[model samples]
Structure formats: C-alpha cells, structure tokens
Target chain A: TRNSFDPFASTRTFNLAMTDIGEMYFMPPLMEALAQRAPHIQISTLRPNAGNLKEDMESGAVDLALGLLPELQTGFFQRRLFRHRYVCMFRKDHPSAKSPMSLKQFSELEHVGVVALNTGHGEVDGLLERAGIKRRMRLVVPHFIAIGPILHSTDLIATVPQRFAVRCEVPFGLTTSPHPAKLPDIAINLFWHAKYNRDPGNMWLRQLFVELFSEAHHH
Target chain B: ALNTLETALTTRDSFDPFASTRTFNLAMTDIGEMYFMPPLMEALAQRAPHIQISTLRPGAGNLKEDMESGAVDLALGLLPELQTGFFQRRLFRHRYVCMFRKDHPSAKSPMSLKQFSELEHVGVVALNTGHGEVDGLLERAGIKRRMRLVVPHFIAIGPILHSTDLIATVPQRFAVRCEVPFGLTTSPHPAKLPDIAINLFWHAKYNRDPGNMWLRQLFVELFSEA
Candidate 1:
C-alpha cells in the first residue's frame, strides 16, 4: 500500500470534479504547475454529478472534487482551500460604481441572477430570500461563466464570489463593492474518498493543490 | 417475446413527435448551446410540445457508444471523432474574427497585421475543437500576438474582451451574436485563418429512425447556411 509514485515518470490520468467557477480560477494555474512537474499526467475536468458523486469517488472514477460541496461530508476526507464571500459586480462605468452601494440600490437595480446547481453557491439565493431582499432579475443564467459577459454589456448588477469578481475585474472592465446584506462566507474545500488515503499519486496531487491554493499554507 | 418484438417494430415505424413523449439527448459544447438552444426550444414548443431536449457535454461520457446506443440523438460542432460509423450534415461555415470592445482603439480602423501583433490578446484553449488552431496559424504566418491571458473555454471571452484593452479572435457567428449584447465589434481576421465547417452528427444506426430523421431535417432547415 506504500508504493512510491514519481509524477515525472508515471503516465496516469486524474479525473477531477468541479463546477464552472472552479474551472475558471483553478485550471490555468494548475495546468501551468503541472506542465513541468508532471508533464505526462492527464487531467480530465468532469462536471460534479450530485447524484453519483459518492459512488464515483469511491469507485476511483473521480480523483478529487473541489468547491463548497456540503453533500460530501458524511464519508469523505476534506481540507479547506480558502474562504470566499459574495460581492456585487457591475460595469466600471455604471453610476453605482462611484458611490457606496446602498441596500435600497441593491434591491432596486436590475440584476443578473445565477441559478447554479449541484454546489453550495446556491445558498446566496436563499439568504437573500430570507432577508426579504427582492431584486429585479432581468436575466437568469445556469452558470457563473455567463455572468461576466452579461454584466459587462448591461447596467445589470450581479452578486458573485469575491475571487471570481477579482478575476474578471480587470479583464472585463468591472467594478465590485461589498454586499449590503450580511451573508455567510463560503468555505471552499478539497475532498477525496478515504479508500485512496494512502495512494501515492492521490497524495501528491492533493498536497500540490493545498500547497498552491490553500490560504492556511500561505499564512 | 414475439409480441414484444412486434410492439417495438410498430412504435419505430409509426414514430410521430407531435403525439409522442420522447426525450432526445444532444451532445455539444457550451458555445454551441448558446447559439443553438433558444431557437431549437422555441420551435419545438410550437411544433412538438411533448418532445424534450437535454444537452450533454461532448467530453463527458463515451460519445461514440452513447450515439450508437441511441442515448445521444445528435452532436453539433467541428467533431472529427465521430467519423467511422456516423453520418453528418454541414450546418454552417464559421470564419474567425477579431472581437473587442466597441470603444477599443483598434475598432476605429480596419485591423492590419501590424496592429494585430501590437495589441494584447486573450487566447482561448477550446480543447478537442479546431478553434485552438488559430494561434498556430498566426504563428506560422509570422504574426505573433502578445498574449495577456489564456482561458479554458470560449464562454468567458465575451466579458473579458468587453472590459479590457485585450483582443480575441473568435468564431464569426459568436461575435455576431454577442455584438449587440456585449457591446462588441468584430472585424475580419488580419491573418488568413481557415474557416471551420460546423456539422450535425448522428450514428448510422439511427440514420433511418424517424425521430432522428425528423430532428436532422429540422436542424438543417433552421441553421444550415448551405
């Protein structure tokens, strides 16, 4: 069970399960890091299947799952990657960009709502609903990937994860401000099944992610 | 067993979408969904209320086997993997174009090769598609772009281009669709990039299936440029 794994010498594939948001922020740097260290390793990013995730990971079909997945808590080994919070994003040229965002303005503006499924990000909607914050949703999209283009093109505003907002801020000509309503911060985690706890390749990959992305390691 | 065989034969021979409750699965890239789904769903609602459509990521499962087993009704894109036992119809030809914000400095003049090289660019890594070849074609033509950022998919290109001084070369139809919504402008690529033939693919086993045949003709009628 304790066989040595050399990433440089082995030709193996690691199947990862994540949401579009994870793909956006994680893949580029992860690939760049792999280019030199594990050049022969193949990484396939699979959409997180909510129904079969347990079976998939237990059967070794999926190597790792990333994001705020509360469903994997019962029988999974997990580590925290970072804490994320939601922020309001809109065009840089929008009038609201000039002033502090008020709760009234937050409710009154035409918003672009994201209906992401199979992850914990969907909690934002429920939080808003509980707070009695009624927003005028002009457009609704299935994934966070579409939020950038819509916000860049229209006066509509969107509440998105802080990391995603920062990623798009400079490239998309966007501005972000703190959310007026108090919402809980999301904890992004890296998860794997305990069956592969001692597997050499899985350990190496897991440590690589924590080393590169875990906020605790940086501190 | 004979009665079951007869029933299956009767259903296959008398397939009618209008009255039949059948769910058809399709395989395509997310970009294809953005371009194809709205019109497809709208038409389906009016004509075949009982028919349903679901999209599968092209890279997810065993596409070849899924198509062969009649699990996937059709696939749309520049797919070269479905060649051995599949039939395809050319939906339209798409040329590459340089897309940027309407107010971009390059938008003021017709893009020249010299100006293209000077501008910072965002490269799209559209895996398993011909779209990524644009960068290579440019490099071979002695045109090198200053790549500012590279993204994993085409879905984010619109917003990235809308906000930055960076320019991206994207499919003409995609640019045209985003022009009005994203406040973008598209110009012909300064480099002589080859156009891609986007096609509709199906397994030969379903070539004679009436449901598959009806949907194939529907796509050709709605989207085919030729």
Candidate 2:
C-alpha cells in the first residue's frame, strides 16, 4: 500500500534545513539533478533552527537536514554524505602562505572566526581551545556567507572545512593548508526523522543526496 | 491574566534599550545581511547591549502577517512589495555596476555596451529583490548577456568574479563593499538602468510602539543617506 509514491510525478515541496556552507556546496548540483529527474518537486531551503528542528522534522515541516549536526543522531536516521577536514585558508599571496605552516605562526596570525550558530562546525573552535592554541581573532562573523571575500582581501586566516576552502580556492584566489592542530574530520550527513524512513519521497531524496555527494561513491 | 496585563502595560509604558531584554527580528536578503550586519551589530553592542537581533530571509514566511503582529520588527533592502499597509523610509538609492577581477581582460573603467554584453557573466537570481531588474533592462536595451553560471545568492559572486573572467552586474553598494576585499573592480554599467531605492519598512500596527519608533530612528540615523 505504501509503494505508490512516485517522485518524478509527485508535485510536492521538500523543505531542507542547512547552513550557508551547505547551500554553497550542495545546492547547484542538487538543483540541476532535481530539474532533470524530479522536475515537479519544489525545494525550499531553511536555516537549521535549533529550538524547533526536532519538532519540525517530526511534524514533517522540515523534510531533511544536512550538515555536521551531532545532535540529530539520537532520534534520526542518517546516511553519510561526505567527511570534511579542518583546513586553514588564506589569500594565495598571504605572507605565510607557504607550505608546512607551523603552529606558532598559525597562532600569531590574525584570524577570522565563523560562529556558525546551531551547527557542528563550531566544534573546530572547541578543538583548538582544548589543544591550547589561541588565535588572535581579528574579526568574527555569524555565518560562512562572506568568508571567501573577507579572506581574499585581508591578511586574516580562517580555519574552515576543507571542502569549503576548495570551493573558494579557485574563485577567490585563496589556498588552504593543513591545520597545525589535530582535529577530527567532520562527517556531514543527511538526516531525517525515523517516521519518514520508509516514506517513498524521503527515501528518493536521501538516495539522491548520497549518490551526488558521498565521498565513497565519487572515489 | 490581570497581573500579566499590568506587567505588559508597565513594560510598554517604560521601554528602555539599556535594560529591556527585547529581541528585534528583521527580514533581509543574504546580500543585505552581508552589507548591514557588521556595522549594525557593532552599533547594537555599543548602544543597546541588552537588545538582540535576528534576521529572516525576505519572502520566507508570511511577511505581512509577521510584521503586522510585530514578530518582525523591520524589513530592509529594495523591497517593492512591502508598500500600501507599511510605512517606509528611504535608506539610500543605488545603481548597478559591473564587477570583475582587477586583472580581467575587459576591466575598463567605462566599458562599452558591446564589450559588456559579449563577455560571460555570473548571474544572481536574488528573488524578492530589485536586482532581478538588471536582466530585463539589458534585454530592453537590445543587449543579451552570455551567462556562464547563475547563482542564487550575491554573497558568492565575489569569489567567482575573482577566479574567472566572468563579469557580474550587481548593486553599487554590494560591489563597493566587495571590490577591495575580493580583488575585484567595478565599472559603470554600460546600459542605463534605473536606480533602486533601498528602504526600511514597518507595519502600520506598530507605528507608535516606543520600541519600534526607537529602532526605526536608529536605522535612519545609522544608514539613511536621503
């Protein structure tokens, strides 16, 4: 009885919750794929609201959430999309843009901190703190929306996910180097409520994300 | 219920920015957020330390109902739809400019219309904003752009311009803010497009609320050029 949901023919809106970074890396390709396959499906991207995320997902207000969200593991079904490592990003012409940047130099340099609220990317800052590495935070922003432009113009360096740096590198004339401090790789996952695990539309979208972005599939 | 009513009356009668814990919600595009948030946050921290700010993307929800109910304190940017039931103040007027890397092959200060139309462009699909008018203006001028890529937000255009020879037609304010930092330069758009008026909008329902009045005055003081 439940096998009747057809993604290609169904006219429905899928609400996705994600951060700015997710939008940058995922949206273009995702939209193109949707256009070719699920032409009738509309997509609305929402900011991941911490207070109402669980309730929204349970109530089907938010169909899926994507990012390095650790909090969603308890009551959700997750499939790994990709894993991202922390990298230090600076202008291609930065004074210390050379390879093998030392921890001392990294700590001495001015930094732009991204306080990406309500997401797991904040864990990088915590990891640095626990490692006793103190950065001279010259500026802080609430989102990753303008980090590319900011880094391209100033001498400031930013620690961001490797994929984000790669996306910005060519366009912004920026380059990335391995972070001096050891940090765990962030596993970006696609999350949905258990209630929708068997729902045909939900399964189709999840499979599409994994197929498009999963590191293993690409490799 | 009586005690609640009395508390509301007391707070409404005596609104203090320094002591009152009020959260002001705003509606703006991502480009508006980039151009406005830094300065706005700094000013808020200095002047109204206890007040909080939240940003909602324009056209995300029932904007009219939200503003009418005072859930959204103000809507900013070149929003033409927020008229009729809303009171608005002109923040500034801005025109369009062509932005590309400084070393771009077609980086002339006053590029010819022929050259501008010939080059590849990065198009911004900024919904609910006046930036969408650029394409139509170009079409009417008998010019067609060769779009290399189209993106949804203006925040990413800086990098794309820096990396490629593609040009982006964007608002003057956005181009000015990004040129220095993104290694990009701006040229007067080859075609004549009408300037857009950026404004602050608040619903008529909250026109006399003391806190609303204070916030409106603050925006005018800080950003209004007209």
Candidate 3:
C-alpha cells in the first residue's frame, strides 16, 4: 500500500531464510550483486524449514525465504526459480565413471546420503524405494558439506542436485552424470507471506532474486 | 566413578607403538583451534600416521561434565576460563592486536584508547553473549567500547572487516596471517591486555594411558617453547 516508499533511501536490514543447499549454491554471487547494487541493505541468513516459515514470516522474523518448496500454501506468495534434476556423483577416477551404470551396478558401491530434516526426504531415494531398488548407503550424514569430503576420500557415490554437482565438481574432485534410474526434478522457489507482499524492502529483495535466477535459468 | 578409578590404578608408564590407531577427540573454541591444533596435527601425522584426530567446538553445556563422562578426550582453551582441578599443561601465551581495513580513516595514525572506544568495532565472543580477556582488560582500564557487530567465531572477522569500517581486536597469530588476504592491516592494541595463557586439559583417568600420554607429550613437543 506504501507506493511512494523508497527501498534504498537509507540503510535497511533484512533476514533471509535459506536451506544449506541454497546457501552454498546461490549465496556467494547473490551477496556480490547485493553488495554492488544496494550497499545500504544488509542481510542475515537463517536456516529454512517449511513448518516454521509461516510463523516466522507472520512474526516479522524473516523477510524472504529460498528453498525447495513442494507444497502450496494459501497465505504465501511463491515463485518458481529453476527446476534441477538429480545426478549421480562420484570421484573423478571412480570405476563407475568408466561405463554406463545399471541399477544393480549403481547399488553395488557404498553411498553417502544426507538426512537433514530441513531439506526433507531425498527425492532420488524415494524414487528408488518405489521402484523396488535399494542403495548401499554406508554413511548417513547431516549436511551436504560433509558429502564432498566423504566422497572425495572414498569410492562412495552420492545422488545430489545437478547444481551441487556442478558447483562442487572442481573443489571436491567429483563428476556427475544422468542417473541409471530416473528421478524427478525439484522446483526451487522464493516465498513471502502476503502480509509483506507490498512492502518496498521485501519487494526489492524479491525482485533481486527474480532477475538473478531468471538469468541463471536462461543460461 | 569406578571406571575412572580402575583406569587410574592400572596406568602404565610405557608408550605403545600401536597407539596410533587410537582416536583423540578434542573440544576447542574456534580461536583456540586456529592457534593450537594445526601444527600439532601435522606433527602427529608424520610421527603416528594412523592417529585419528577430530575436533568439536565448545557449547553452552557444562564442559567438566562432558570431560568426566568421556565425551571429550582433551580440551584446548584459555586457562583462567576453564574449570579448575583438571590436569593441564600450558600450550602458549597469546597476545592481541587490533585490525582494520588498510584504507580505514585511522590507518595513517596510531589508534588511541579513546579513539578505539569511540569507533565502530567488531567483536568475537566465542560464548554467545560473554566477553573474552580483552573485554576484561578494557573494563579494568575504565574504557567502554561500542561493538557495532559481534560474531561468534574469528573466521567471520575477515569478511566483515573487509566490507565495513569496523575494527577488530584479535589474537596476534590469526590477525597476522589474515592481513594480506583480507586487505587488512594491524596495529598494537590500544589497551595493553595481558597475554592469554592457553592450555590442554584432560581428566586424570587418561593421564598415564599410552595414547593420551603420547598426545600430551606431542603437544608439548610441537607447541611448547623450550
């Protein structure tokens, strides 16, 4: 309702809730753009959880949220960013890299998987479960950061987002490819409660992501 | 209690060659690990290739209880801040230095205590709301500083200092290494805070065990001044 409000008239602080995957994959470049375009705005990132996002937004605890949101809500405004598919990740020199993998061959090696409640159940694992295929997951880790190190030092394979496989490939010495089994792509979304939909600061923040990710999805 | 007593009674003096497979879990602060652990870990890797070393940051719970229950094998931290009556050996005495962006307004001149207290400052308090040794010394000197921002760990100091006009007072070892990479420079601390004596502490039950004994001796060998 405040049409004449200037978003960058003075220094403003905004809280953004993001999951670890989004933070690691998206925050660096987004932060750089924010620093250049709006030096007056400061952002603090909080961990994201769908169950708490409604209350968090209503209480004015968080201004924006970026994560993989599958469930639609009546009280919040959401926009799809980009759809990413699951890719099988392994060390560069791994045996599996030499040939096309079968479902049986894929389940032969040890695997590392994340069990964070925030990101919820892995889509690939659920897909494999319904297909009557079981993975030999030897290590159950809490976060994706741990996945890089475990996969780097061992022969284990992990199913991670294509964005993660690309972002971490060089650093973690990993390679990714289409999985032997098909898995669904997930839609990353930006969400805000209808309460702050018209607020100038929140609008500016949302616009930044829209432009950044639109360019990302196009490329 | 019985397990601790039994282990204390069965303590052996000889070091075992196969003790390299034994894992040592340490509880430390971020600043504490930056200063103490790396060189010791390097030495252990060469001396005992299989000796597994892992570290965890300290939390709000009672550390003494954690140590007593065998949840922590050793702890590296400030001596005066730790609970007493544990077996400890001094690692080193670390001092402070003030850091700010090289182009900061005060970079051309020596920062006085008055100017430092008045300027926007960045602080690292490992304990969420608690202050460290530098704060105690500043309070004793009758100075009050405005901390515009405070972070829980020293790792964030680089980014915040690079982006803002805030100045940070940090341990010398960390500040020195970050100078070139973070586009920062350092000056002698305005208030002369006493050097912090850091030490490694463990329970008496593990005092003479071959693995723990080797670990303590390793720290002394690698870190202690002759």
User: Per-candidate TM vs. native?
Assistant: 0.58, 0.60, 0.63
- lDDT of each structure? 0.76, 0.76, 0.67
lDDT of 3 at B49: 56
Tens digits of per-residue lDDT, candidate 2, B71-161, equal: 8889988776677668888999877888888998656888998888777676776665788777777778788876545655665566566
Please count the clashing residue pairs in each candidate, in the order shown: 2, 0, 0
User: Quick one: how many clashes does candidate 1 have?
Assistant: 2
Candidate 1 — which residues are off by over 4 angstroms? A1-19, A22-219, B1-13
State residue A169's C-alpha deviation in candidate 1, in Å: 17
Model 2 chain B is weakest, by summed lDDT over 10 consecutive residues, at B1-10
lDDT of 2 at B73: 87
Instruction: Give the better candidate number (2 or 3) by DockQ.
Output: 3
Residue A94 displacement in candidate 3 (angstroms):
19
* Total colliding residue pairs, candidate 3: 0
Query: How displaced is residue B156 in candidate 1, in Å?
Result: 1.5
DockQ of each: 0.07, 0.09, 0.11
Return the top candidate by DockQ. Answer: 3
DockQ of 3: 0.11
After superposition, the stretches of candidate 2 with alpha carbons farther than 4 Å from their true spots are: A1-82, A85-143, A146-219, B1-11
| Sequence-dependent TM-score of model 2 | 0.60
Q: Compared to the true structure, candidate 1 yields what TM-score?
A: 0.58
Candidate with best lDDT: 1
